[PDB]
Amino acid sequence: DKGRGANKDRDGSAHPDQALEQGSRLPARMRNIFPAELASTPLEDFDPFYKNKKTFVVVTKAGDIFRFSGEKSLWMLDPFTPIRRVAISTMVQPIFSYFIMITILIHCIFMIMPATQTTYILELVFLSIYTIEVVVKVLARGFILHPFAYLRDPWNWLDFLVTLIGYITLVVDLGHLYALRAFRVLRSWRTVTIVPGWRTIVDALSLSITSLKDLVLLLLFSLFVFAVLGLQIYMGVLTQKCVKHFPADGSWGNFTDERWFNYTSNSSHWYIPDDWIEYPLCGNSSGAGMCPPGYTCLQGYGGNPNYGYTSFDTFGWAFLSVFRLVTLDYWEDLYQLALRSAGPWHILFFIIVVFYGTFCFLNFILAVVVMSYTHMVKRADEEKAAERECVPWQKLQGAIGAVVLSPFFELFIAVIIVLNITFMALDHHDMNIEFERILRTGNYIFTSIYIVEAVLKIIALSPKFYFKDSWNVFDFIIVVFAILELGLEGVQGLSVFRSFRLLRVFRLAKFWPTLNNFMSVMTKSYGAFVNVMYVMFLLLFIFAIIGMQLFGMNYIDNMERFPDGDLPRWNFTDFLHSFMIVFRALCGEWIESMWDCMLVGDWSCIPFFVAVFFVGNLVILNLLIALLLNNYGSARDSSVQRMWSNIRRVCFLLAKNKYFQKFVTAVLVITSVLLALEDIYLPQRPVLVNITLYVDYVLTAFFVIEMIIMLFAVGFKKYFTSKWYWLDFIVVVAYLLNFVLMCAGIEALQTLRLLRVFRLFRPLSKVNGMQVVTSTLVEAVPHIFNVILVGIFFWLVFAIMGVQLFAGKFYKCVDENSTVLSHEITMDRNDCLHENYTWENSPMNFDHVGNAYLSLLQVATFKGWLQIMNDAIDSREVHKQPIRETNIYMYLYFIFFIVFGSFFILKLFVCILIDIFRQQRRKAEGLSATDSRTQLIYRRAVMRTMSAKPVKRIPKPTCHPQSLMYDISVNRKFEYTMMILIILNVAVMAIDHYGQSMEFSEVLDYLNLIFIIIFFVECVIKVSGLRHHYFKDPWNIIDFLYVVLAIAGLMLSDVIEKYFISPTLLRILRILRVGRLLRYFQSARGMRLLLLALRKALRTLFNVSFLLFVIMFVYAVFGMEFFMHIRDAGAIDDVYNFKTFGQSIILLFQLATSAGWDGVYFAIANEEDCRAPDHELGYPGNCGSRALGIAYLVSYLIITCLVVINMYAAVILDYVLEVYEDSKEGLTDDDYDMFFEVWQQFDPEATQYIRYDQLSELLEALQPPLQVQKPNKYKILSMNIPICKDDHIFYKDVLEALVKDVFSRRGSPVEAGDVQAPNVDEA
């Protein structure tokens, strides 16, 4: 409406429409003394063929509506209808505009090469093309205002802006920068338009990003507290190397002052085991590493990790690496190196950082993306809604037709394939001569069947008609390329014809049900999907070519700061590297690039790989979840019976009861809590050896009675029946076997007795939340295993591909200490086996299908897929040796995998898990009848109204001038200004470097002294004022402790420490105050809007927190009795083992997010060495666990990284959707709170009334939309406001009346009666 009004005004008012370009015609507004072709209204045709065209255009417009016109608007100064006008007309019309795009696409193909041809001459061409074009557009429209409008309308912003700089670049200073080359390429962001609709998504990401601007102001604070924490805990913790002491009475030193600081400073003796290029962080808080013997562990000695840029000291680095954590990225180092350093207690920090920041604040962005995406599609549905509304031969033929119809044919068809699928499904490297010949026989047999089935159908029914069915068209395309296949391999050459065998595999979709369904919905977005796709490449391409010319000539020139290497594998030299390195950062690892970039490239790289992360991953790759979500929304007869009643009242009586029931649950806990402290060290000196064995017997004594009393009490028929009572019977089974082997026998079957842990489940669902989350898991799992059947399927395609070209390779020559030699000594399996030595494999190969399958999953979840992908590049024949650079075009094989694997399927687990979780909230709280999303809003408002009664208003004790104190405690001066002090106290901590002069130390000591005195005043003025309402007041309790500890700290003095304080918690409690601010944010109301959200979720969000704690505790104990001694090589550093119960959780929180599960897998799949465990005197158990691993990690990553950690996401995006939902319609919770705030003001003594005369003021004292501003008497008098004598009004009459107003002030129509009905019901 507003837009329309604006348009009308311009038609009026003081803009001019110069031309309207419509359907290849430029129709011509002029000049209020002067014309050209004003009329008709109506489909006339006054003049002319031009006239006719105009008429046609008009007609089209009337049909259509707005669509589509190109408006050039005008005055302004000059130009009536010769030369400028003509020019304008030319520009309006569209094939020219098609031109400039081309010269745009021509630059892209020209820029992507290298430098090569120096046509700078051809470079000079395209500028002059655009120099003309910069001229046409400013000539069309006008003059100084419209260069001011040419600034203005913003796609055009980029055509001027960039091309001045492209004009600048001819200008020559070769002085300073070559940044002129930098921003040249941005031109190609035009090319989005091309392709077709273009508009929800470009307009998605535009509405995606400028809503997130609010939210960014959150996390820029959100990071800034924790990087402080890291600064303040972790400062120069992350430099503990391990240094020797002395030759004591030896050779070096005496007086240990200027030489002990010298003998430790030299980087020649501190510990390295075997060239692990960096330096091996140590510890000496117990548990946390250490470090081998004759040593000790010092802090401040040279360097720090990856390339000097990990550590938490010096604030600005502490920002980057903490922001690493919120990304959840390669932290497998920054995990471990910290715990080698400090201790195994500091995951309690890393839970905060990862749990609180990056499990919230990466969802909060997805929250914004999906909301902004849905808001534009429903906006785009309005266009979608409006535009819609001989005899023998004959007999034979008949027979053929019959067989086509039959239950015969498709069956045997679907047989032949599930068999043919199986023939391609072997393709070994070894593949015995007889096996090879079998396989070759397989296809000539099976290819003929295809032609026959195909040759007969076409003949059985109707040629021209036969090509109506696309599947039969698809069926025909098989055997055309099948008969292609055969000739090449008669003929002799070549190669790629073979993989069109894999086009067969698709034939299966028609025979499926679930899969024709799945393939069908994407045939809904042949468009939306590929449009989303096209920008993802474009944005990335935009960053690819700016990366090359920008970082660029640094990799080749410097060349030597790298770890004694010439170039790394992920550089910025050509396009394909510089496309791959930017794509690597999109999926998201982006540090190891950005070490590698900044090490050599000085500064400017830091903005670039954060700009590829936000704009790349959190904006695009969360958008691609919103695409899948909006598309895939789919006497003894009585006496024994009296005993049978006595057993019914023994059991059914005793059974419902809490007091036994909790007695069972408590026991399962402390029995399983005993089960934690088992292993390696049980045989420690056998107090637990014995009780773990007592608890063994006396548990099974409790489980067999458990089983009687449940057996008889509830239900014979339905006890043997259902699932959670199955898991009991099977425990009781299971502990029955062990007794069975205490005498007649003997061993403990260990794993039988570990299904005791399995029953802790159903205390857990009962807990005061998980009822929601549980119901959403065990419901999920049917639809999950529907996706998975699918997700096999595409991987099944991609795998057997990679066998047909990958299989056989991955066999590099190696001397025993692992060195790929290089070349020239190597290049076949002869010259490495003819010398003597060891032509050996890489552990994640593509030899089999299951070997190729698992090794594809490492590139699925982006772990260890650098390490595959280098070897994959390098390999170039079956029995020859792989070389470092060659065969790099098939590094694009992964890109056609990683899209159709990782973003389209691995994130499709999210678009199941959100669709289920909205429904389970409906069956908690709600219904399924409303279903149109408004009635439910109304009901929730009604329930919110019914809720609150009032504050007390902590109302005064009397005096001395104690009264003063409460005149300042509640004031709006003191809370700001004392709070303002807390933000001051923060920024103190922000200044601090490592070890820093005393000069700085004296200052911070001085300033810390100041602030606590003011705080000590804050406390007692706060204390004397409210006193007990202090402690109903959460922050102040915290605000109280840090004060008290400060007096503990600084006051008496110390002596000694520990025995109270020490410096961790003192500073921790000081930082925890700064979260007082979320109270104070109420300013711009989109950001307090979303944080109300967070609390609405946190209690269900803690609940999911517990399952993750739990199925950790599950799989640690269950793995632990699997994963006793197993070497170590390569991510169980002999501190991060499955040995104890501590590290088994330290391990698995790494695996929780699935960061570093390859190198973990590589240990538990390591089969080389072993001394076979004898179960005798002796054994070194340190041996192996293949099948015991695959069925563990894959059973972990599906459970943790797929469902439950995305279940984490489904909670936040439900609630944050619900909240913007209310706000749109509606009435958030903030509003209700502010109402009672101001109600308290007017009703201090919580009488729950208010006087007649004060009502008007109360209606004035509210925030919109509840607020009825003065004058308001005539409006109030409108609402139903009953008064009790004498002239008092009750609150909820007021609440009801006021809230009923607002939905009025919102709306009209039919909701309202619904609302009324709801109210009535409530009453």
Ligand SMILES: *[C@@H]1O[C@H](CO)[C@@H](O[C@@H]2O[C@H](CO)[C@@H](O[C@@H]3O[C@H](CO[C@@H]4O[C@H](CO)[C@@H](O)[C@H](O)[C@@H]4O)[C@@H](O)[C@H](O[C@@H]4O[C@H](CO)[C@@H](O)[C@H](O)[C@@H]4O)[C@@H]3O)[C@H](O)[C@H]2NC(C)=O)[C@H](O)[C@H]1NC(C)=O
């Ligand atoms: C746990 O880990 C911590 C580190 O986080 C270890 O702490 C280290 O402990 C070492 C002893 O076990 C300390 O060595 C001492 O360090 C003194 C440092 O000297 C100062 O240097 C400044 C710099 O200019 C000088 O101005 C000062 O004047 C100091 O001299 C050595 O001087 C000291 O040498 C001894 O001194 C005594 C007198 O006190 C002599 O009689 C004796 O003959 C010997 O020369 C001594 O070597 C080390 O500094 C300390 N780390 C830090 C960063 O301070 C813990 O030891 C670890 N836990 C365990 C149980 O080992």
Ligand SMILES: *[C@@H]1O[C@H](CO)[C@@H](O[C@@H]2O[C@H](CO)[C@@H](O[C@@H]3O[C@H](CO)[C@@H](O)[C@H](O)[C@@H]3O)[C@H](O)[C@H]2NC(C)=O)[C@H](O)[C@H]1NC(C)=O
């Ligand atoms: C640990 O102490 C030793 C000596 O106890 C230090 O050795 C120093 O080694 C340097 C070699 O680089 C010697 O170089 C001298 O430098 C000056 C100025 O560059 C020059 O004029 C001399 O002709 C000579 O080249 C130096 O003599 C020697 N120091 C002493 C006191 O003799 C070593 O540097 C110490 N380690 C660390 C990490 O400081």
Ligand SMILES: *[C@@H]1O[C@H](CO)[C@@H](O[C@@H]2O[C@H](CO)[C@@H](O[C@@H]3O[C@H](CO)[C@@H](O)[C@H](O)[C@@H]3O)[C@H](O)[C@H]2NC(C)=O)[C@H](O)[C@H]1NC(C)=O
């Ligand atoms: C760090 O420690 C290493 C050894 O732990 C030091 O290397 C040593 O450097 C000294 C000179 O400072 C060398 O002494 C020289 O010996 C040769 C004969 O071998 C003689 O021709 C010279 O006149 C001089 O005396 C010593 O050989 C060398 N040893 C080793 C094993 O490398 C290094 O200097 C230390 N650096 C710092 C900064 O402390």
Ligand SMILES: *[C@@H]1O[C@H](CO)[C@@H](O[C@@H]2O[C@H](CO)[C@@H](O[C@@H]3O[C@H](CO)[C@@H](O)[C@H](O)[C@@H]3O)[C@H](O)[C@H]2NC(C)=O)[C@H](O)[C@H]1NC(C)=O
């Ligand atoms: C195992 O890996 C390392 C390379 O990463 C190599 O170990 C080195 O092996 C040599 C003997 O082959 C050790 O002895 C050295 O021999 C040279 C003469 O060639 C002599 O000048 C030295 O004083 C020393 O005696 C050498 O210490 C050792 N390196 C280390 C750091 O311990 C080796 O190439 C690999 N093994 C095989 C079989 O290739």
Ligand SMILES: *[C@@H]1O[C@H](CO)[C@@H](O[C@@H]2O[C@H](CO)[C@@H](O[C@@H]3O[C@H](CO)[C@@H](O)[C@H](O)[C@@H]3O)[C@H](O)[C@H]2NC(C)=O)[C@H](O)[C@H]1NC(C)=O
């Ligand atoms: C590494 O490969 C070389 C060959 O490239 C192997 O050397 C060969 O070793 C065998 C037995 O050790 C030698 O055969 C016998 O040698 C004795 C002399 O000791 C001779 O009297 C016999 O008549 C018989 O020929 C063979 O000559 C020798 N060849 C060469 C060229 O040295 C070696 O065994 C391989 N080592 C490993 C660890 O694989």
Ligand SMILES: *[C@@H]1O[C@H](CO)[C@@H](O[C@@H]2O[C@H](CO)[C@@H](O)[C@H](O)[C@H]2NC(C)=O)[C@H](O)[C@H]1NC(C)=O
């Ligand atoms: C470390 O330095 C001290 C410096 O005093 C050495 O002590 C001297 O040692 C010599 C012989 O080694 C004696 O003749 C002196 O009398 C000692 N000085 C004193 C004050 O007693 C000490 O020997 C040195 N340590 C080593 C291992 O050489």
Ligand SMILES: *[C@@H]1O[C@H](CO)[C@@H](O)[C@H](O)[C@H]1NC(C)=O
């Ligand atoms: C290469 O390997 C084949 C394997 O049969 C062998 O016969 C041949 O002699 C080898 N050639 C060289 C040059 O080592």
